[PDB]
Amino acid sequence: GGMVAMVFASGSHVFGGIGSIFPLFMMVGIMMMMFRGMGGGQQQMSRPKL
Amino acid sequence: MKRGFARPTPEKPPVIKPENIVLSTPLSIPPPEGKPWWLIVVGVVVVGLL
């Protein structure tokens, strides 16, 4: 967000309108990896084994 | 009239040797360990979108 904000403070306004889709899709993918993710050897019941 | 024939001491026959053999146990199939394939796929998308 700081990166988007930096571009906004400089005045490019390139992310206005449809250009904003790039930060949005990126932010969703990052969310999936950090909250759910996958376990190591301590979690034996991985979906394919169960 | 026949020719005489006296039977001598029997010659040694070839000796038979038995054998006890234990078979090798077959190999065991490796259980299905599994990689979190989707995680690295999202990863390469995120770094590319950046």
Q: Which residues of A3-19 are buried (b: 16+ CB within 10 A; e: fewer)?
A: eeeeeeeeeeeeeeeee
Compute the distance between CA of residue A22 and CA of residue A3 in angstroms, rounded to an integer: 12
Contact A26 B46 (CB under 8 A): yes
Q: Nearest Cα to A32, choosing from B34, B50, B49, B42?
A: B42
**Residue A15 contacts residue A8 (beta carbons within 8 Å):** yes
Residue entry with tokens 């403070």: A9
Q: How far lies B20's CA from each of B11, B24, B25, B26, in Å?
A: 29, 14, 16, 19
Please name the residue of chain A whose CA is at the shortest distance from the CA of residue B47. A26
Q: Which residues contact A26 (CB under 8 A, 6 or more apart)?
A: B46, B49, B50
Per-residue tokens: B9: 């001491």
Judged by phi (left if over 0) then psi (alpha if -120 to 50, else beta), residue A18 lies in: alpha
Residue A10 distance to chain B (closest CA, Å) = 19
